[PDB]
Amino acid sequence: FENRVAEKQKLFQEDNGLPVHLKGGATDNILYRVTMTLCLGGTLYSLYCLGWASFPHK
Amino acid sequence: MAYPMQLGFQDATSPIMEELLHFHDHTLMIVFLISSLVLYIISLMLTTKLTHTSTMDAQEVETIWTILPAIILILIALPSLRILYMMDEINNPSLTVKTMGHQWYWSYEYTDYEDLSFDSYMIPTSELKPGELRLLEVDNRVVLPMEMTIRMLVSSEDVLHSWAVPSLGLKTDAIPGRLNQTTLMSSRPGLYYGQCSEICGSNHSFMPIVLELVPLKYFEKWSASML
Amino acid sequence: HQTHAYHMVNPSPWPLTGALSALLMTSGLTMWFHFNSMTLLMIGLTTNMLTMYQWWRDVIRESTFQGHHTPAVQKGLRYGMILFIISEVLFFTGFFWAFYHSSLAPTPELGGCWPPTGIHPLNPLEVPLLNTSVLLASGVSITWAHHSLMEGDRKHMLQALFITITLGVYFTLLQASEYYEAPFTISDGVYGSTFFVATGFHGLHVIIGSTFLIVCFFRQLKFHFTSNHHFGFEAAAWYWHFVDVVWLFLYVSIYWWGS
Amino acid sequence: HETDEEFDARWVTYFNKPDIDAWELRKGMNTLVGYDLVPEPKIIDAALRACRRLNDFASAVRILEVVKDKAGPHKEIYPYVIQELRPTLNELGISTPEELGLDKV
Amino acid sequence: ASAAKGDHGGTGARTWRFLTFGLALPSVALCTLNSWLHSGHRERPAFIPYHHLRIRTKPFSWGDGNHTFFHNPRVNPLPTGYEK
Amino acid sequence: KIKNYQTAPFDSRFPNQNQTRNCWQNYLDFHRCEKAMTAKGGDVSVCEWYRRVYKSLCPISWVSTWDDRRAEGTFPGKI
Amino acid sequence: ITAKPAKTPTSPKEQAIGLSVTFLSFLLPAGWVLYHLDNYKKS
Amino acid sequence: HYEEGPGKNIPFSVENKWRLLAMMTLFFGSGFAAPFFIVRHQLLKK
Amino acid sequence: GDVEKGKKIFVQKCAQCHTVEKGGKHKTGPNLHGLFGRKTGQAPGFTYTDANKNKGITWKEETLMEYLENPKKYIPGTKMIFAGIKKKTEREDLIAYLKKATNE
Amino acid sequence: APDFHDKYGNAVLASGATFCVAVWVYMATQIGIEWNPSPVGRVTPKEWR
Amino acid sequence: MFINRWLFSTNHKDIGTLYLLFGAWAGMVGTALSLLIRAELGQPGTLLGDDQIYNVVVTAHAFVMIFFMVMPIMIGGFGNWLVPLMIGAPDMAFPRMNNMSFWLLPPSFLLLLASSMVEAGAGTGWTVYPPLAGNLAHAGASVDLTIFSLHLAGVSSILGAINFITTIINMKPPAMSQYQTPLFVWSVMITAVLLLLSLPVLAAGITMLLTDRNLNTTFFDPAGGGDPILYQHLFWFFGHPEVYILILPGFGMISHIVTYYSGKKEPFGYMGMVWAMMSIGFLGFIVWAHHMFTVGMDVDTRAYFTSATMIIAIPTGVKVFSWLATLHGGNIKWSPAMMWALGFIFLFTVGGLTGIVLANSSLDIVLHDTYYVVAHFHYVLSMGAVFAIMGGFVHWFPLFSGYTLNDTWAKIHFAIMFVGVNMTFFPQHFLGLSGMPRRYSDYPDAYTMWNTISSMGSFISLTAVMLMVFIIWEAFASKREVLTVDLTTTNLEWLNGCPPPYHTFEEPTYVNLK
Amino acid sequence: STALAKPQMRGLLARRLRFHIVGAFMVSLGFATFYKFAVAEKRKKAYADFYRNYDSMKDFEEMRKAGIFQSAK
Amino acid sequence: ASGGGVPTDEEQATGLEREVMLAARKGQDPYNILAPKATSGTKEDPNLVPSITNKRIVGCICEEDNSTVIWFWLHKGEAQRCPSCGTHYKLVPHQLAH
Amino acid sequence: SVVKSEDYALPSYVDRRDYPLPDVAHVKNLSASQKALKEKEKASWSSLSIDEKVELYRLKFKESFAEMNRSTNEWKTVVGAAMFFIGFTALLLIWEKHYVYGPIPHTFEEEWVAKQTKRMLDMKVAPIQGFSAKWDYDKNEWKK
Ligand code: HEA
Ligand SMILES: CCCCC/C=C\C/C=C/C/C=C\C/C=C\CCCC(=O)O[C@H](COC(=O)CCCCCCCCCCCCCCCCC)COP(=O)(O)OCCN
Ligand SMILES: CCCCCCCCCCO[C@@H]1O[C@H](CO)[C@@H](O[C@H]2O[C@H](CO)[C@@H](O)[C@H](O)[C@H]2O)[C@H](O)[C@H]1O
Ligand code: CUA
Ligand SMILES: [O-][O-]
Ligand SMILES: [Cu+2]
Ligand SMILES: [Mg+2]
Ligand code: NA
Ligand code: NA
Ligand SMILES: [Zn+2]
């Protein structure tokens, strides 16, 4: 392994206005989008499961 | 039992409940002394145009208002603890009666001599006989001899309940797997009511306790007739 | 431009995703327990991992890559980790309380004795003794890793951290195996309850602590730590020590004294 | 702790400083009215004379108001203070709040 | 105690490494041997349907609802006894 | 022989509100006594006092559960 | 505390509107449910 | 950057007092209503 | 046994989950008109467990004596939640009440 | 200049207290609320057996 | 823009505003639940159904007022808004973790409202005792949803505790010692230490309840050798510190309000106030079993718990007398906030004294599980904690918003609430003395008059709450922007204007060591 | 026309507090006995007079004749 | 028994951490990590209060161990005085942009 | 005055009994005759008229002590408005009695109460102070 921390410091200090969670590049965007879709889809699914469990149908 | 517009405790039916009335009078007098002193002092602080807004020295007046409360607390604790220990002292009962809480009724077992047991259910409102008390009467009362030291043992066969009779100063939780003991001694014959005192589900409000205190000789006949 | 030394964090989505994953895991355990379904639960564990990954990733970017961890910021993190460990100690204290309450006053359903009738405790001198020597040895090897790092020695830091992780893994497989061989189960009354819940939460904390050490090992491979600035490593060592001490209390209380 | 006399003397000295500035005049008065007392005429006399060296007529009238205010419901104190200040009020041409109709609500 | 030890005239990594290889790992090796000796299959207890054990107040949420999570057929009887 | 029995006396081993163990100890004492008497061919009526005390103190459903469990071979206390 | 004059003064009549609307938002929905209690109580 | 100052440091608009009234009404009124509707849900079950 | 004693026991312990009359609707548990001389799990249009459906005993005084003492012992898997009636004499009276009442 | 309190304070006080009293007396006495007061000095006990 | 600001916040002021909005909405939920309780009791008979649906309401009332109303408002709302500003810090220590403490509460509250929607609800009491809360007497998901709701609120507050302690210890100006921080800062720090230590124990206990309900453990089930009373120990070891947690930040606010509206630069006896709060936080850990005096504990244990509980009156009396000594000699301004604080002082005192009556295990036998306990805790919560919150809200609302309230309306609001809460809870002393039990949907006829009066009281407090909404509306509707605030030299939170900019103290304060 | 006398000008708030704090005590202690004599002492005497010649058997015979007991007609 | 490979702060510290580090070596405190020591506080010897802008908030602990701190804005230009004890403060340029 | 937005940081004016000399003068911008009057103020105050003196006082201070201390009629509005709102509450209590509450139980009917009272007296409910103590058993009436 070689010490490549100076390169990363340069990338994360670049003056492009990006918040830290997106500053790594397009991969950050994808991961962010996956996480937020699963959390939001999941929360909607949990609301669905609430409504279902809220009535009896037997 | 309680009666309409009542302010304080139900009349004492046991010497220990009498002790608790006097101790509550002693404590409430103190509560009234402290609460009125605070209200008077607040009024005093708020009714003058004179001011003093510079720094005030806090090490002299602070002693009094630390030490006088401590003394007051001991004046409460001393008679409070006398009574706690009185209630715990050895008594020698002449009878032991068990009660089991259920959802939602009480059973009683008197098993010193015979296998006597029965259930005790609230009288529904629509079945009260004229002059009977809503939510308080039961079909089978807890018949007990008056003027006798009785060991009550309390448990449950399902959830927590709590067996209480305010007149006698009693409240003992009913915990499945556990056998809690309290002592009962009525100075008088009569009918003495109480109500389940631990939330136990749908009909918590609807599983009361009624003691029927009568001379030993009547208690005997009634026991025999209940077998 | 600020003239204090503290870190103004960029607005971040991970708190909201962390919160939502907690909703999904909890409502997911509900569905698994009552509606025979693992779906919500697996979504929530997924989002929970994704959230932890990106959150701590971002803390690494902020500190190693961006230089925000001034001594004042680092001191704050010291406090935060010490307070978090304190709260984990009080969490275990509840399980020890439960253990001692049940074992000091055994009820009649148990036969009025401890261990209960029908319970054959593990021998505290067999695998539990080995687990003990494994966690203790790992306290020694992590302290070697710390000193190597302060003295600037990359290779011995990595060897020592590697040994420490290997012992945590060894403990974890010893424990998994002892769980499989134990002739009592979690449903074997209050003995099985206190035993598996207390040592199970401990097992989980060993897996967490070992994973934190693995993160430190990878950050070290990538040269993140300087010989003077390596708070991720110290937090993981304090947590590792906390994990070792709880085991000592388990081993004395539950394996030795309660056998 | 000091005597009443020594407290009063320190305050008289404070306001008598020839080149007292406006900040010091304000600080002295706002400090002094925080105490549990109505200031002696000799202190108020020195503060009014400071207002004169500072060409500040309005603050002189305000100082007389605050003396009345410090006395709260003890209504005999302010007429006594005014009496004692009369020769200074006349020398400096200071009108009292009453003479200016500033006591009317 | 001290144990039998010695040092504070020098540099820490070297000592902690000495402790790791000279005391800590030898200890783990001895306990490992000690286990890989004083082990071997304890005979299975003998079933008694005790009511404080094999508690079932709700089915578990996996399998057929009646097996514990690390169920071992050799040593963990079900409420009705050992299986298969 | 020492009847007159009104109820179980105060027992200084169990002086507190929780009486669970007083019931249990007397229940065990009765059954241990009676097993030992039959084993050693002896009396059994010497066990009576313990039966009176447990019967006084013990909820009927406890006694009856413990009795079913002894007949089942699942009583957890040593007799 | 002192303040500037109200940028958009709310007159007595507008207060009466705001008060009324606020009270009705609490009272009508609850009032509706409590009025129809016995309908649900039909098991 | 974000707007600053009175009426700008909040997640709801106070530009129009009548829109504001409607929002506050739905906000507080929904929290106040919710337990009556849940009691009703439970009564309608049996 | 004693019918009106058995009436009280039925009101307090069973009426809440059972009705007795010809007609009377299924509540938590099946209606009971015509119980005696007859097989188990046969009340028209009630959903039994398979334990109660497939029990294969005939209700009469004798089989009700055993079952009411301990329902889940007699019918393992039962959905009837009821501990049971310990007293022989109370079981006799409840049965004598049900003998009369479940048949006009 | 008189303020709101100067102009309307007497009227708010008079009308508010009049309204408050009238509506509370009315609610307490005219619509069948069961107060369950004490029977003492008021009820004639009657045979119940 | 909106999403970055309000969902992704790392700013202490906006996160405090979020907590205040959440706590205000939860207070509406709590209030409705309190009216449903008092409607059920407001005449003899059954209004709703039996005790199951009644106690689902009583249990939610309590969880909502405590976990979603009082703690979020006091600690999340006033704590986040005020603590950084009072120590000249640029934000909290962990500004992104602070945002997670907030966002855990909506899902916690959703779980609570799911508990009440499925099955028949968790009609357990807010203490959640087994076996009533176990899987036979409360089969199905409700109580597990309730447990999970408590786990999330617990995590939210533990991480909030870590953030406040680390912020208050580490982020003061370097010359400012702990003995130079305001009493409100102290009060939040001490509350934080109580949260930090008490919530994990609650967490261990409700996890054991979850595993008894779903994994066949038997911590609390006698059949496996467990003990229902072990759950009560664990619960109350959290639950007594929990009541000090609900009041301590209120004590801090009251010291600020009483000082401010007395025209003083500081509270009387500052070091005595710090000592009293530290003494109260410590003693609040060693008294929990006074919630268990009827469970069957030995007499010596009951004697110890009686005595240790009373001792807490001494440091608390020092705070009440020090507030009076603060008023002494003040230039009293009768603002609405001061009126809240004076009502707090007297009414909290009354509630603390009935707590001392309850501390005596001998008398508590007859008062336990009766309305006398309910009277006690509503005097210290529905007057105490709530009055300190309303006093703090009226006092600081122009700082947070930039706009002033109409003071006449706010005084009107105080008067109505004062009458309502006293009419509601005062008669509950008589009901408790005379034997009326807690958690009852109906009562023997003799208890009619006081129940009737108490329910009428609850409607007057409703009218106050409605009026409060209108008053906040009027303020935002009128837009009177703050000009001058007095006493800024001893109230640093005001010195950046109203509202302060999004970033404050970007340049820290200068403080000499001297 | 005759000077006004010099009045007391110092410690006016403190003088006020020292005068009134005595009364605060007396009114609150003051109530003193009131609860004590009007409520407590009356209670002690009520229980002592009730039981001084109480006849528990005559009390029971009265209740029995009134038909109140399940155990005793 | 040893070799190297671990970077130092001097080689690898960056951003504000590095600025604080380099400034500490020169005895400088641009990010306000240390408490300043008071001067005699007279008009002739005022406390010098660095600011990067035209005003800064001062807290004055007027006597040692006061629990009450007196706060006020100090403005660019002529020295101002604590309103409680009168000690003098004067704003001076930051330097601070270093 | 183009002092408005950095203004919170500037010294400001307050009328308060306990801070008689505020940090700034009330009037910020003077007219010509007010400036002439400030210059005249540097000479003997005896040469100033009453009106000039009041003017100098009003340049420096907004309200006199007597103004800032005046009592107001606010309590009338506050007490009367509180009573109005508590009276409105009774309207709600009327509606709830009329439309939420059904039948009170039959045990509150006058005949039930007459018989229940006798039975309470026959069992001597609270015979020491609370209830039956108030019954005269000899004369068979309530005690006077
Ligand atoms: C704000 C919340 C709060 C606070 C601060 C307190 C404070 C105290 N409480 Fe309370 N309490 C609760 C909320 C709180 N309580 C709740 C919610 C419950 C019920 C839980 C449940 O079951 O659901 C409860 C229950 C509870 C019980 C259990 C009763 C029972 O269930 O049977 C007891 C018993 O000791 C108790 C006592 C006390 C005491 C001694 C104090 C002390 O801290 C009070 C100290 C204050 C003073 C004494 C007044 C000021 C002092 C002076 C003016 C000095 C002079 C005074 C004297 C010399 C006496 N409380
Ligand atoms: C190998 C050692 C490492 C341990 C990790 C192992 C895997 C499971 C997950 C661990 C999570 C930790 C503890 C949760 C409690 C129960 C698990 C205890 C440890 C364990 O794994 O116990 C097993 C049973 O597990 C079971 O039920 C398994 C059921 C899993 C259900 C999870 C329940 C989730 C509980 C909620 C946790 C809430 C946390 C609260 C947060 C704090 C808030 C501040 C033992 O197996 P057995 O066959 O019964 O006996 C062995 C006989 N041969
Ligand atoms: C616990 C706190 C809650 C206190 C609430 C008390 C306040 C009451 C407010 C009014 O509520 C309304 O009352 C009407 C009746 O007055 C209802 O109409 C009902 O009655 C009308 C007339 O009888 C019918 O016309 C309607 O169709 C029928 O819904 C209407 O739905 C309901 O919104
Ligand atoms: Cu049984 Cu409550
Ligand atoms: O709780 O007090
Ligand atoms: Cu407590
Ligand atoms: Mg209880
Ligand atoms: Na280090
Ligand atoms: Na009701
Ligand atoms: Zn100073």
Residue numbers in the entry:
A (entry chain J): 1 to 58
B (entry chain B): 1 to 227
C (entry chain C): 3 to 261
D (entry chain E): 5 to 109
E (entry chain G): 1 to 84
F (entry chain H): 7 to 85
G (entry chain M): 1 to 43
H (entry chain L): 2 to 47
How does the study describe this entry?
Mitochondrial cytochrome c oxidase (CcO) transfers electrons from cytochrome c (Cyt.c) to O2 to generate H2O, a process coupled to proton pumping. CcO initially accepts electrons from cytochrome c (Cyt.c) to reduce a dioxygen molecule (Ferguson‐Miller & Babcock, 1996; Yoshikawa & Shimada, 2015). Electron transfer (ET) from CuA to the O2 reduction center is coupled to proton pumping across the membrane. To elucidate the mechanism of electron transfer, we determined the structure of the mammalian Cyt.c–CcO complex at 2.0‐Å resolution and identified an electron transfer pathway from Cyt.c to CcO.
Therefore, in this study, we optimized the three‐dimensional (3D) crystallization conditions for ferri‐Cyt.c and oxidized CcO at high pH and solved the X‐ray structure of the complex at 2.0‐Å resolution. The asymmetric unit of the monoclinic lattice contains a dimer consisting of two complexes of CcO and Cyt.c. CcO interacts with Cyt.c mainly via subunit II, with 94% of the contact surface of CcO with Cyt.c belonging to subunit II, and 5 and 1% of it belonging to subunits VIb and I, respectively. The distance between the iron atom of heme c and the copper atom of CuA is 23.0 Å. The dominant ET pathway from the heme c iron to CuA of CcO was explored using the Pathways plugin for VMD (Humphrey et al, 1996; Balabin et al, 2012). The calculations suggest that the most probable ET pathway, as shown in Figs 2 and EV2, proceeds through the iron atom of heme c (Cyt.c)‐Cys14 (Cyt.c)‐Lys13 (Cyt.c)‐Tyr105 (subunit II of CcO)‐Met207 (subunit II of CcO)‐CuA. Prominent inter‐molecular interactions in this region include six hydrogen bonds or salt bridges between CcO and Cyt.c. Lys8 (Cyt.c) interacts with Asp139 of subunit II (CcO) via a salt bridge, Gln12 (Cyt.c) forms hydrogen bonds with Asp139 (CcO subunit II), Lys13 (Cyt.c) forms hydrogen bonds with Tyr105 and Tyr121 (CcO subunit II) and a salt bridge with Asp119 (CcO subunit II), and Lys87 (Cyt.c) forms hydrogen bonds with Ser117 (CcO subunit II). In the Cyt.c–CcO complex system, water molecules on the surfaces of each protein are preserved to form three layers upon docking, but each protein specifically interacts via the long arms of side chains. Cyt.c in the Cyt.c–CcO complex undergoes a large fluctuation, using the regions interacting with CcO as a fulcrum.
